[PDB]
Amino acid sequence: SMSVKKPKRDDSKDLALCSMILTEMETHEDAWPFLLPVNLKLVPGYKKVIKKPMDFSTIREKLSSGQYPNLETFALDVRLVFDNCETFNEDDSDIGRAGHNMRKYFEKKWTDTFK
């Protein structure tokens, strides 16, 4: 509350560390469904069904231009990429499986880097 603060967690490396995580996501072999925005002209249903499209290139541009106020807003956009994938793709598909694998990969890097 006013003039009563919890001890200051060091957040000065968060930007660099989120960039490293995102690099590792970009270079994973199952990243290919997620590297670029879904083409809304060429994928029937996507525009109407997926209210907030997100992809790694879009996260990379937001990261690079100071559009994440903190590390939690960054994790929300990464998770959105996988939540979107699960909304649109059967679990038993190459893309569905890719999404589950990437989410698992991300969540471990996240816990190990920050928790």
Query: Domain limits of the chain?
Result: 1-115
The CA-CA-CA angle for residues 115, 104, 79, to 5°, reads 80
Residues near 110 by beta carbon (within 8 Å), at least 6 away in sequence: 21, 75
Burial 13-23 (b: 16+ CB within 10 A, else e): ebeebbeebbe
CATH superfamily of 1-115: Bromodomain-like (1.20.920.10)
Q: What share of the chain is helix, strand, coil (3-state, %, to 5)?
A: 60, 0, 40
* Resolution, expressed in angstroms to one decimal: 1.9
Nearest to 34 by CA among 108, 90, 98, 110: 98
Long-range contacts, stretch 49-52, CB < 8 angstroms, 24+ apart: 49/87, 49/88, 50/84, 50/87, 50/88, 52/80, 52/84
Method: X-ray
> Do the beta carbons of residue 77 and residue 47 sit within 8 Å?
no
d(CA 58, CA 21): 15
